[model samples]
Target: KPVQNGSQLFIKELRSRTFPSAEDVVARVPGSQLTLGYMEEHGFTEPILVPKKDGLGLAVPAPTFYVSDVENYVGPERSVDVTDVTKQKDCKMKLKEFVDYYYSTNRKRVLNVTNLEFSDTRMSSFVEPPDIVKKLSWVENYWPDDALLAKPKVTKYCLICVKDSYTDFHIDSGGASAWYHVLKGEKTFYLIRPASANISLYERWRSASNHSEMFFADQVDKCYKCIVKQGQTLFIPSGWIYATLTPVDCLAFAGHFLHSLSVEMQMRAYEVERRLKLGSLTQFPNFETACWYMGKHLLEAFKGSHKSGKQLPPHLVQGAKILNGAFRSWTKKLAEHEDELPEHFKPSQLIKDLAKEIRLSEN
Candidate 1:
């Protein structure tokens, strides 16, 4: 039943091949156990899997909310970006058109709608992220409403992927971490670590002329496959390279966020995006301004804690050090990225005070 085209055959072979199981590598914890305290100790460096019953804490719609429900809520006339997986090209189409294609029998092409942001619509109320994301995310907690830069809208996506749909490996823009909840059907994720050597190899592979022809998993030392079923949730940490395949038609809720748990990794991811010249559409908009806001907020928190004699959390201390270092490096190239600085951010003042507090904490 495989397609006759060469590119289609290549994709088929890649999906069929076996890979190491991600079970041993990813943390499998109960929904009740996915607490902020747990994340603080382990950090968000590895992917985490939560079972359906446990995944109830996330604010996604009930399992009964199918593609038809989506049409009813989001309206069939809304335009969405669709990906033709075999051809790796994008085109705009109406949601109703996609829904019609999705339910049709014996489809010849695999199409994916992964970037449907329904934040402005009623569907947004049903899809809140985990407690940890709400507490630590820069976009959620730090972005100012009055700032000239608009907030990053990477959060809150409704992914409708037909069976056999495949998405090539990529890092979420701005080096943000991601969370996905399979509302229906199932999805298989091919996960890769973001080690320095692996990141370098990925960049080379991405720039190569025949990148589409090569299976990125083979270029790496290890790639793990994890299958997420209906009602289950998968949380991927920042900078992890991964690819997705919809084993069956799947309706999923997903979002991306930047947090302090892995500030260094996020910084590394942002640098890679810059070197690769990834487009603005795919990037976390106004990333530097967001970082500036985060820095300002952390500085205030440190000051308040110092005055009140309240001990700052260890994670916050470490996050400040990493951000301070990043600020220094970015300041050195201020001429190149000065426009990214927030209107009211005083980089020199903030950086000096952060170093002062961090040094004092160490002593």
Candidate 2:
């Protein structure tokens, strides 16, 4: 595919970067054979790919799914966010207008509309999250239904990109783990792991006035290029940084989740959000409240095990201690974000009880 003009600077950077393929670091699993138990035992510490030959674990519509189908399901009247990567500008357009333009011939501009979340629309019935995600997601499994804030509907999104669309390096919102299944065309990802040094550099770069002018991959020791083709799925864990290049016009399904496997990593990502003062729309909804709920759940589960004379596992003990310390810190600054504290969540009692439980388990 040829690159028509948009942002030559961005395209130049996208085409010029040299990196090793991420094949060695990425895990591969047969789509049909991937089970929750396998992931539970192994943990998703790195990216995983589900090749098209194995079939996708997600319940996305077959190869026939296309832009027209989305128009029919989501309605052409809904306005969607669109970005012109070449010019680095953003605008909104009606879904129908975007679709019409997509199929139109002789288009020169590279436009992308990636934030079309469809979880509440009729389009939602066409795709379902992976089984492990449904089972492990904090939002799916633990978010209180009656909380003051509505549950985040970030679990289903449809990405539409014209040929040569380029998304700059970014961590998914709230450092949530994410999954993408391409229905058509392909995407090439430039991936960077969120090591302490890399994340610190990323923070500084983001704060820099000329951040976009500099290529982020050049600052890191290794950047991975992974291609996700049609009918394949890619799973990216929390805190990993990535940028996407659409090799061809494409339609993709994606979702974000927070899980039990890496609470500390999630907290660290959330900390970045706090320090950066990211907008409300970009941050996870009620992230701290969910942590409080998890804390209470841990206290009860640990108490049950203690009463039953069963020793607590060391990993769970460590996670509990982490949660305990975070709670103490958050409560100390409760006045700053007091609205985020759920009325039903008694932080002081929960914190005191959790500390005592941790001491008991340690002994």
Candidate 3:
């Protein structure tokens, strides 16, 4: 059986626009920090392969990475998580096993490899993540080589999903924002707006074991669906409940990054995950540690800029206060046992550092 759709009255469509430069976008969109935008026209309409052109308006050219090309470059032994969505059965498999199934004439399973990260592996050297990702990456700014902090190795992912491979709806880890680019094939996204009511439904669904038994979109007012074609890129804001499907055999590249812009949403999603025992639902590594570091990091950066007579974005400054208080309250709640208190998310050392770095505004 296939995933069921919600009533027609509640179905909506996603908005799309012409491809715009990354610089022009950052300042225009409100919550502009975590906006989800898609671009269809970049002269990349050819479904041939992902790009690596020098002057193709791409930070990196068309030859950057290709799904079909990976079989030749990456080893067959690379491990991957393979899942059959229909049965809710998942297991670990090597790249060759997945590739064999993807290419086989008689396919038995609707398998998907959704979380393949190679940032630290030899396979990572062959490709580059998007340019916009570099600007907002937490690893690039908050954590320097000399700094003594644990860094999360979750940025780029190589996905190969056959037609009919579907993933259940959920938000990205720690509410960090995400971006996706299709190199080959196509994907469709079912996006639910994060209105209070929609998110409330999500929280309850996530907390229950029967989550997969029911389609989440049915419970919400309106859920938008967008079909992303070859060469198009999509940016998913933090905390948007979403589900995905590959209409054709697909090979895509995606990156997840955290920034100061959506600090409040990030904290809320993290808190909700803890309340729902959502560790098994997401792959965000050291999420609690990252949230703690983000508050102090943003405040400290703003303080440095202010001392040098530079004006700071009011949003960033205010975002810090939101993060400060959310964590403080999260630490206070003692229900659901110690399960609610994330390990290494303690407010002691991190908060002390925050006090030193942040000179709170009078407001």
Candidate 4:
């Protein structure tokens, strides 16, 4: 439902390299997803190969229930948000109503069910993220139990979309990386990289008040179309902008996480949001607060690693440096609203001290 495109648009692939496991390559490689094999690496496209032990490939059965099958577990009268991209309209209605409307054969609009996390439901008990994600997850490993970051353990979401449902290009919450595993049917993703030119264009488009009215894919240099079919898992790296669509009625599991490996792009994306005066954080309201605690997490990384005779990861170091800059930038930038912050949260002092310690550690 967007504008036309150019011949130069191309989504390239890894011509001929084999993929290992998600945990082994997620932080190591750039992006994309996983493919099929009997634990055998066929073409260059098989990005992650696990032993029979991982059970993450096709043999991994779909959840015992379909999204519609869980209707009994969710609140039928509960309201769910729905967005119509072509019209740029957003509205909310009862879950049962939205579900019925979304599943209806006579289509009036392209409706999508995205971002409904069900961490507490029994249906959630049936499905889970793969082993690779669990090993590398920041929420599972980094956040202290009492921290606010620990408040939301809802990293699992169920996606139920009808044929033709579409979502516009976006970075995940907090600029975190994401993964999607298709349980049934197929979905198409039009992906674009955030190279300098692209990021600039995206920032401009995102800032425009009429942005929602414009189809972003047409504005970019090259937008690549990717297909994620049944039983396949896709890992989209942090900072890649992508729009999603359903080619058929589909059910899928998807989640996003902010991790040590992805913090550079995470902070970069957040800064772009700050420049736009979007909010306390871009795409996420409490992002600044997460930064508050994460700054300390960065400092702790340097101290613990240096003391243990371990060389620091380059991305981790870069992330800390960039995060420090963000910390200082906020201190100076958000000074206008210092009074709005709780006395304990005024971060200028905390950041200054952290900066000194980090500079010393860099030596």
Candidate 5:
């Protein structure tokens, strides 16, 4: 199906405090799926205050760090560097130091730590694998079978803890849907656009031609923010630029749909590059290369790339085309049922109401 513009789309929020017991929760979703639950009045750790020295406080960018052994570093020893090694014993300290050091040095807007392993205790015991995740049910539902799963999962089940005072606004690449449930503390979630809107704002932000940081700041002036209390599930559709603010230590589960098709597309691109001897051409000819890159991201416009067409893979393109028709039909159904959807399941009323005012002005 042709991708739906973001303006035409609206979200449905479902609000219900009714939760099953821990055992029931596990059984309901199984161990493969992801569920977001927000609770009211949850307790959490206190926020760590980094005091300002004089008038200048420590300028720290968002840091992303992976948990690894301290022995891995062979660099020259220094108090700051060696202290990092010691901090490795506690994942939290290790992460904070890594962000602080990177921010101190690079002066960049964001730092990302890859391959972060989590301890189970940090994740709620109520969290169990969703059934859809276990059997790869998404394949039958929509999303491709090869998109990469960006969110973390468990091997042996461990606890993970994270404290984010602020998070940069960004969107998922695979167009995977996300659900965030605040376990402890409060957070404000700012969603940029819905699936049906033109989403030109997000497109410009993601475009390689623009500096994302500058674009984000400019767009922030026009965006809306929603406060999600504890135990409330916030559904973040794919491709929305979202930011979070936490005054106290907040714990939340951020889960996304697994898109396996993305991996397949990457592999296919790699093969094409190898065959065309274009693998080494980091700089491509003209804006065509840029457009091709954008085309590659087009699959995200749909739930998954099961449709066939010019962009479809040799084996899957035909199916993708067929599925495209199905997607259109599904979207029609969704539009028709928009009013019937539960209140919490719908898009932000605040955004909708404001949009209504804006629309009426044109009339």
Candidate 6:
């Protein structure tokens, strides 16, 4: 069925019931379900039963406690381990057991029983089942299958402990759209429009000595901050600058998608980056790198850099070109090819063949 107008209103209404307990929210939502039996059977009850700093009642989910015996079980790691170190540690457990453990333990962390917190390194290992995400449905609804894309997969789950705060304003790679459902504790999120939305605004606020902090601090006043309780979910659009302000923890889910507008904006940023290099404007090392990264890949088609000559159709090419030209310099520096680049720049066999073709054409 087509999405009706005011769909967000309906979603918000449905989501309201689950506030204070994601387990309740998931159970109540039709067509979406969570397996809470494992938690219940294991003597885990209450979503978040932690007390706030002032000893006030905070409705947060409690962290899952692993059978202490299983902590040392040496098993093969699951595929979700992006870092080899984690893969080795996880290898000792089966995927089912690992996920079950994660589901249980993550709840505990969300509830603040554990001191674990989300960080770039830890978030790298998180994974999610493809079938359960609503954003997937959103993408399938809007995007053509042939368009180059990256769907959000679960990364890692962790509990946020009190007194520890999230790193100030930032965005994720791959132009990801993230949703955080408070499983246990109270979390406050602040959001701002992307730099693309107002470059002047971001620049004007930047500090002379420490621009990153200035950029983030400037948005603190301009952006909206919401205090999300357990079971409530917050949607963060791709490329928007955002952060978690509270010491409280929650179950945060991040999803990455390639949308028409995001893809176009990303490509434009890349083109800008590339041209800046040619123009002798060295890379803005402190700039938010994710936008440039997404933009760089989007413009690759124009340079005929991809395996296929055309990742985008001809109708979209002219627009892509214009967008790429607008942000070429920034995008060039944001190119996601850092790890994929050859150790030494060289003319490959394919390049040699191309060179031969050019010579033959001249002859």
Best by lDDT: 1
Candidate 5 weakest ten by summed lDDT: 39-48
Q: Look at candidate 3 and tell me the lDDT of residue 264.
A: 70
lDDT of 5 by residue, 32-139 (tens): 122211110110011111111111111111122122221122111211211111122112235445534443644322222322323233323324433323322133
Which 10-residue window in model 2 sums to the lowest lDDT?
1-10
Of 3 and 6, the candidate ranking higher by TM-score: 3
Q: In candidate 1, which residue ranges exceed 4 Å CA deviation?
A: 1-6, 53-56, 145-148, 308-315, 329-339
Q: Select the stronger candidate by TM-score from 4 and 5.
A: 4
Relative to the true structure, candidate 4 reaches a TM of 0.75
- After the best TM-score superposition of candidate 3, give how far the Cα of residue 122 lies from its true spot, in angstroms: 3.6
Q: Write the per-residue lDDT of candidate 3 for residues 1-363, one digit (tens) a residue.
A: 333222111112212322222232222211122212221122111111222223222332253555545655566788777776556667888888888887788997778888887666666665576554566666666554654444776776777888766777887878877777777788877777666677778999878766766778768866666666776667676778888777678877777877665677777787777787755734677665565556656656767876886745666666766766766665656453234333454466555555544454432
Report the candidate with higher lDDT, 1 versus 5.
1
Which of the two candidates, 2 or 3, achieves a greater TM-score against the reference? 2
Residue 193 lDDT, candidate 1, scale 0-100 = 96
- Sorted by lDDT (best first), the order is 1, 2, 3, 4, 6, 5
On TM-score, the leading prediction is 2
Worst-scoring 10-residue span by lDDT in model 4: 4-13
lDDT of 6 by residue, 95-148 (tens): 344445445634322112121222234233332312323332234343234433
What digit string (tens of lDDT, one per residue) describes model 2 on residues 1-363?
333334665576567667799886888888765666776677777898888534444687887877898999999999898887876667889999888889889876778888889988998988888876787788777776777766776889899998888887777777889889888999998889989999898878767766766677889998999999998889998899888888789899888888878787888888877887744544567777777777877888888986789977676678789888888898867686666676677888989998898888888
Candidate 6 or 2, higher TM-score? 2
Going through the candidates in the order shown, the clash numbers are: 0, 2, 7, 1, 57, 45
lDDT per residue, candidate 4, 1-363, as tens digits? 333111011111221212232343322221123322211132221123222223442223345656567565655765666665445456777778877876677877766667667676655666667655655555656555665333344477778787766676676667766778777888877677777788788889878877765667667766765667776677676777777767678888777666565667777787676677653222553555555556666677767875887756666667677777776766666654353233245476667766676676577
